[PDB]
Amino acid sequence: KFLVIAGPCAIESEELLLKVGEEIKRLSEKFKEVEFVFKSSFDKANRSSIHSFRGHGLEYGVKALRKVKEEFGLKITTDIHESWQAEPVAEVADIIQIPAFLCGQTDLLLAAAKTGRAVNVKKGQFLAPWDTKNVVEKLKFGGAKEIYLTERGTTFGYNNLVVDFRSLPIMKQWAKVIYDATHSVQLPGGMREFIFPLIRAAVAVGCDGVFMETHPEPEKALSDASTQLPLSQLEGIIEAILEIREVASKYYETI
Amino acid sequence: EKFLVIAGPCAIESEELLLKVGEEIKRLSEKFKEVEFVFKSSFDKANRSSIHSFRGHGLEYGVKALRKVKEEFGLKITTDIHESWQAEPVAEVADIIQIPAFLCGQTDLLLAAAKTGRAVNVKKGQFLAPWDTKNVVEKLKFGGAKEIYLTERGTTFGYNNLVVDFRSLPIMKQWAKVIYDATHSVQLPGGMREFIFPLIRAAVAVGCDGVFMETHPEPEKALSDASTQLPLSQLEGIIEAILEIREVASKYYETI
Amino acid sequence: KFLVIAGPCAIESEELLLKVGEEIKRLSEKFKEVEFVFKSSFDKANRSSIHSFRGHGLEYGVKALRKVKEEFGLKITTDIHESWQAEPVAEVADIIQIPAFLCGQTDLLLAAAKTGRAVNVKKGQFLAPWDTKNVVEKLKFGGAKEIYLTERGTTFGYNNLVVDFRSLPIMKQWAKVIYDATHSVQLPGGMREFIFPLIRAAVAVGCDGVFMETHPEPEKALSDASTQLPLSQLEGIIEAILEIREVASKYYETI
Amino acid sequence: EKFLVIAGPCAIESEELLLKVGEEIKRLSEKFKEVEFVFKSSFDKANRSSIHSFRGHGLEYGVKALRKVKEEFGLKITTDIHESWQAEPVAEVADIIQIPAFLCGQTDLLLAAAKTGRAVNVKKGQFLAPWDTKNVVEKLKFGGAKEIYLTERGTTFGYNNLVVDFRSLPIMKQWAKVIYDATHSVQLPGGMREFIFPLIRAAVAVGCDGVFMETHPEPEKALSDASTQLPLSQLEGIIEAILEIREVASKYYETI
Ligand SMILES: O=C[C@H](O)[C@H](O)[C@H](O)COP(=O)(O)O
Ligand SMILES: O=C[C@H](O)[C@H](O)[C@H](O)COP(=O)(O)O
C-alpha cells in the first residue's frame, strides 16, 4: 500500500515524539489504506554551524523511538551516519535511512543491509537518476530485500535545489520510490509555500510514497523550522494526495 | 475558468497537414466543451541547430494556411514571430501572438506584439528565473497588451538538458496566466517522449491555466521535433486525463 | 595578433565615445603587438525594465562610431538586433557582433555574414561549447570569412553565470575565441572583483582576444554600471594579460 | 609563500607502486626547492560507483605503505578518512588529513581530524557554494585545527558533469589556504584528461596556495580514475609550467 513517512525532523525530546506520534496514530486509524512510518533523527550530523542543535545521542533517540513503537504500534525509521550505528538502530528501526550525502558510502550501505531491515536511500543532490541503479545493487549485494530510493532535489546552481520529476519513473525501474516533500524545497546553506504543490505533482506523476517532516509548532523547531509542516495540516494534505492518486493512478506508466 | 489547450504541428509543413490536424482538434473541441482550443503551428523555425534543417515555406504561405484552418474549422490561431515587422501581418490571423523563448527579452518584439491588440504568449527563456518574468509582463502591459500568458518550457540544466522547476507555475501566476509546454520541456537542446505524459500530469496537479502540446499525424515523419511531437491519435486520451487530474486537484490550488 | 575589444557598454553620447576612444588610441600606440577594436552598443535591446536606458538610435550610434574611426583610426564593432540593421551597421563596423540571446537566429547570422564584414558571435548562456560548431557553419554558409566566438558565461542556476574554461579549447576547433571579461561576472536579473582574476585565467588557458567594457566613471554608467571597468585601470590589466600570455603561450595546446 | 604540490597515485594498489611514484616525487622535490611536496594515496576508495570496483587493501596495509614512503623518501604524507575512528590511526603517518568531498559537512569526521593536531584538507563538496565553506572552517577551528586547506574539485553542473567556478578561489581564500584539484575537476561523475593542463593553468593564474594532482606510472592500468590520472613522466613538465605562470601572475594576485 501507499507509504507515508512522517514525523519531526529531529528528536527534540521523546515528549515531542509522543505528541506527533499520537496524531500519526490517529491518521493511521483514519487511513487504513496507507502504511504510516514514524520518522525522526537522533542526530543531525551535518548542520551548517557547529553551534546548531544536533540531538541527544543515539541511545536517547533509540529509546524515544522505542516508546513510540510500543505506545502506538507504529513502524519506525531513522537515519544512520556511520557503519557502527546500523546494528543498534536496527533494534527499533523497521526502515534504516541513508542520508543524501552518504548515499555513495559503500560500508554504510552494506552495514544497513546486513541488519535485515528495509533500507531507504535519500538520493544525493549530486546524483543522476540512472546512477541510483548502482546504489540498489550495492544494497542487494549486502542482503537487502526491501529497498527504497527517495527523491529530495538536485543541486541547481548555488543554495538552490530543483526537483526533476523525470527521476520518479527512472528510479522506479529498480526500487520503490518515495518523494521527500520537505527537503526538496529547502535552500542549502526553503519556501513552505511550495511543499503542497510539489507533493501534488509527485503523486500525479506516480510514486510509492511520500516523506514529510511535521512539527506541532514549526516556528519553534530546532532544525528545519522554516520547512516542517504544521501538525494540524497533515491530515488535509494526506487526504488530498490520496484523492489525486486515486484518479491519476489510472495513468501511471508500467515500468 | 476555461482551461486552455494549445496544440498543433510544430511547423507548417503544408496546408494539407494543418487541415488534417485541425480536423482532429475541431472534433475534440466539440467533445471537450470546457476547453478553449487554440491551433498552433510555426510559419518559420528561425533557430534550427543546422543551416540545412527545415525552416518553413515563408510568412505569406503560413498565414494563408493558418487562415484556412480558422475559416474551415472556426478555431482560434497562434503562431510565433521572430522580428518586429512580422507582428502586424501575423496579427491578421493569429488570436494569440507567441514570443519565442530566446527572444522573451527583446523589448521591440514584445512592444510590436502588444500594440496589435492580440493576446500575447511569451515562452519563458531557458535562461530566465521565474521571478524575472515580472518585468517581461510589465513591458507587455506598457505596450498595450491586455491578455498575457507565460509559458513554462524548461530551464538550462547543465549541457544539452532542460529541467522543469514546477515552482515556476505558482510564481509566474502572480502576474500572468500560466501555460505548461509539454513538448519542448523534455527536449535535449542540441528528446524523450516517455516523459511528456508524466510531466504534464505534474503540471495540472500543481495548477496552470493551460497546456501547450505539439502533435503530428506521424511524428516519425515530422520535419521538426520528430522525437517529441505527440502522435495525433493520442491527443484525446491525454486531454481527458489532464482534465480529470485538474478537476480532482483543483480544490487544493492555492490563491495568489 | 592578440585582439582587445574595449569601449563603453552603451553609446551614451559621442562625447563619451571620444573620451574613451582617446585612451584606447593611446593604448593602441603603446601596445603595437595588440589589435584594438572599439566597441559600444547603439541600442540595449533587452534591458530588464521597460524604463531603463536603451540608447539614442542606430543613426546617432553609427554616426558617433564613425567619428571615433575617423578621429582615431580605430577598428569598430557594435551589435545588431534584427536583420535589417546589418547593412547600415556594416558601413562603419569592421566586426559585426551577434548578441548572446540571438546566436541561434539564422536570419540575423546570414544578414551579418552577407555584409562581408567579420562576425563575432556571443555564445548563448544556454549553449554548449560543441554546439557553436553549427553557428560557425551557418556564418560560413552566408559567406563569412573572419569568424569569432565569445565566451560570456553559462546559465548556472538562477541569476548566476559560471565560466567553464573548457569552452575555450573546444570552440578553438572552429573559430577564433574571445573572452568577455565583463558580462561573464554579471548576475542576470555582478562582482567587479572577479573581472581581473577571470581575465588572467582566460589568457593562461589560451584565447585569441579579450573583450572588456570600460567607462570613465562606471558609477554613472547608464548600463552595466557595476561591471564596467574604470578607464584608468585598462592599461594595467592589458599589460598584465600580455605578460601572462607571453609566458603561458608556450603551453597552449595545438587545436 | 612556499607553493604546495599534492601528488601521488589515486589508490594504494600496492606498496611497490607507491615507492615507484614516491621516487619520482622525491626527485622533483630536490629540483623544485620552492615547492612543498606532499605524497598522496588513498588506503580506501569508499564510494566507487560499483560494488565490484577496486577499493583498496585496508587501513592497516595502507598506513604501513605510506609510512614506508615517508621513511624511504622523507616526504610529507596525506590520505583521506571516511569515518571518525580512522582519524587516530591515520594521524600516525599522515601530515595532512584529507576529508572527502561528500563528507565535507560531517561534523564528527571534521572534529575527529581536528583533534589529532595534524593539518586538515577538506575537499569542497560538489553541492557546496564557495561562501558556505566558511562554516566548515569554523567547525575545524572549533575542533582544534591550526592548519586548514580547502580544495576546489568542481561543482555539480547538470547530470554527470562538473564545472570549475574559479570565483571560488578568491572567495575561499578569505578563511583558509586554497588548493586546486586538477584531476577530479575534469571527471564526469558516473573523465577528460585533455582539460587537466589548461584548467590547472587557469588555477595558478587566478591564484591558489597549491595544486592537487593524481599521477600513475601507467594511467591505462590504474585501478581507479584510469582516465584522469596523469602519466608520471608528465609531472615535471606540468609543475615547471605552473611555477612559471604563478611567478608572472603573482604580482597581480589581489589581497584578501
Ligand atoms: O526554439 C526551438 C525549439 O526548441 C525547437 O524544438 C527547435 O527548432 C530545435 O531545433 P533543432 O532540432 O534543429 O535543434
Ligand atoms: O570521490 C571519489 C572520486 O570522484 C573518484 O574519482 C571516485 O572513486 C569515482 O569512482 P568511480 O570511477 O567508481 O565512479
Cβ contacts (< 8 Å) between D195 and chain C: which residues?
166, 169
**Which residues have C-beta within 8 Å of that of residue C113, sequence separation ≥ 6?**
C119, C138, C139, C140, C141, C142, C143, C144
Helix-strand-coil percent breakdown of chain A, rounded to 5?
Answer: 45, 20, 35
CA–CA gap between residue C47 and residue C54 (Å, rounded): 7
Q: Are strands B3-8 and B96-99 parallel, antiparallel or unpaired?
A: unpaired
Mutate which of D163, D194, D200 to disrupt the C interface (most C C-beta within 10 Å)?
A: D163
Q: Are C111 and C83 in contact (CB under 8 A)?
A: yes
User: Closest ligand 1 atom to the C-alpha of B123?
Assistant: 1
Cβ contacts (< 8 Å) between B158 and chain D: which residues?
157-159, 161
CA–CA gap between residue C152 and residue C186 (Å, rounded): 9
Q: Are D150 and D172 in contact (CB under 8 A)?
A: yes
Pick from D35, A157, D53: nearest CA to C158: A157
Angle between helices C132-141 and C106-114 (to 10 degrees): 50
Distances (CA, A) of B189 to A57, B101, B231, C222: 49, 13, 21, 34
Deposited resolution, Å: 1.7
DSSP secondary structure letters along chain C:
-EEEEEE-SB-S-HHHHHHHHHHHHHHHHH-TTEEEEEE-BS--TT-SSTTS---S-HHHHHHHHHHHHHHH--EEEEE-SSGGGHHHHHTT-SEEEE-GGGTT-HHHHHHHHHT-SEEEEEPPTT--GGGHHHHHHHHHHTT--SEEEEE--EE-SSS-EE--TTHHHHHTTTSEEEEETTGGG------GGGHHHHHHHHHHH--SEEEEEEES-GGG-SSSTTTSEEGGGHHHHHHHHHHHHHHHGGG----
Provide the 10 A C-beta neighbour count for residue A191: 13
Domain boundaries, chain D: 1-256
User: Cα A88 to chain center, whole Å?
Assistant: 20
> Which amino acid is residue C217, in one-letter code?
E
Joined together, the cell numbers standing for residue C177 give 575565441
Residue written as cell 569568424? C147
Q: Are D44 and D58 in contact (CB under 8 A)?
A: yes
Q: What is the distance in A from the centroid of ligand 2 to the CA of D187?
A: 9
Assign B118 to helix, strand or coil: coil
Which ligand is nearest to the Cα of residue D212, counting in written order? 2
Tell me the technique behind this structure. X-ray
Evaluate: CB of D45 within 6 angstroms of ligand 2: yes
Provide the 10 A C-beta neighbour count for residue D255: 4
Q: D102 and A107 in contact by Cβ < 8 A? A: no
**Which residues have C-beta within 8 Å of that of residue D172, sequence separation ≥ 6?**
D124, D130, D133, D150, D152, D178
> Which fold does the domain B1-256 belong to in CATH?
TIM Barrel (3.20.20)
Tell whether C203 is within 8 A of chain D (Cβ): yes
Joined together, the cell numbers standing for residue B157 give 540544466
Evaluate: CB of D116 within 6 angstroms of ligand 2: no
Q: Burial-class residue B14 by CB neighbours within 10 Å (0-12, 13-18, 19+).
A: middle
CA–CA gap between residue D206 and residue D195 (Å, rounded): 17
Q: Are strands A161-162 and A154-155 parallel, antiparallel or unpaired?
A: antiparallel
Touching partners of A (3+ C-beta pairs < 8 Å): B, C, D
Residue written as cell 552518504? A102
Reported as type and span, the H/E element at residue B121 is: strand B119-123
Evaluate: CB of B225 within 6 angstroms of ligand 1: yes
If one residue of D41, D43, D44, D49 were mutated to test the ligand 2 pocket, choosing by the most ligand atoms within 8 A of its CB, it would be D49
DSSP secondary structure letters along D159-200:
SS-EE--TTHHHHHTTTSEEEEETTGGG------GGGHHHHH
**Which residues have C-beta within 8 Å of that of residue B207, sequence separation ≥ 6?**
A197, B169, B170, B173, B249, B250, B253, B254
Pick from A114, C41, A204, A187: nearest CA to B249: A204
CA–CA gap between residue B135 and residue D171 (Å, rounded): 32
> Which amino acid is residue D198, in one-letter code?
P
Reported as type and span, the H/E element at residue A27 is: helix A14-30
Tell whether A156 is within 8 A of chain C (Cβ): yes
Reported as type and span, the H/E element at residue D4 is: strand D3-8
Cβ contacts (< 8 Å) between A160 and chain C: which residues?
157-158
How big is chain D, counted in residues?
256
CA–CA gap between residue B122 and residue B141 (Å, rounded): 13
Backbone angles phi, psi at B166, to 5 degrees: -65, -10
Evaluate: CB of D224 within 6 angstroms of ligand 2: yes
Assign B149 to helix, strand or coil: strand
Tell whether B241 is within 8 A of chain A (Cβ): yes
**Which residues have C-beta within 8 Å of that of residue A238, sequence separation ≥ 6?**
A4, A27, A31, A34
Reported as type and span, the H/E element at residue A162 is: strand A161-162
Joined together, the cell numbers standing for residue C229 give 571597468
Which ligand is nearest to the Cα of residue B151, counting in written order? 1
Cβ contacts (< 8 Å) between C128 and chain B: which residues?
159-160, 189-190
Reported as type and span, the H/E element at residue A212 is: strand A209-215
If one residue of D43, D55, D187, D213 were mutated to test the ligand 2 pocket, choosing by the most ligand atoms within 8 A of its CB, it would be D187
Assign A34 to helix, strand or coil: strand
Q: What's the CATH architecture for C1-255?
A: Alpha-Beta Barrel (3.20)
Cβ contacts (< 8 Å) between D165 and chain C: which residues?
156, 162-163
Q: Are D198 and C165 in contact (CB under 8 A)?
A: yes
CA–CA gap between residue A2 and residue C16 (Å, rounded): 68
Q: D46 and A107 in contact by Cβ < 8 A? A: yes
Provide the 10 A C-beta neighbour count for residue D226: 14
Tell whether D157 is within 8 A of chain B (Cβ): yes
User: Cα C90 to chain center, whole Å?
Assistant: 16
Q: Are C181 and C191 in contact (CB under 8 A)?
A: no
Q: B157 and D161 in contact by Cβ < 8 A? A: no
If one residue of D40, D42, D48 were mutated to test the ligand 2 pocket, choosing by the most ligand atoms within 8 A of its CB, it would be D48
Q: Ligand 2 atom 1: the closest Cα is on which residue?
A: D47
Joined together, the cell numbers standing for residue B100 give 519565442
Q: Burial-class residue B218 by CB neighbours within 10 Å (0-12, 13-18, 19+).
A: exposed
Q: What is the distance in A from the centroid of ligand 2 to the CA of D53?
A: 10
Joined together, the cell numbers standing for residue C134 give 553549427
Pick from B142, B132, B84: nearest CA to B108: B84
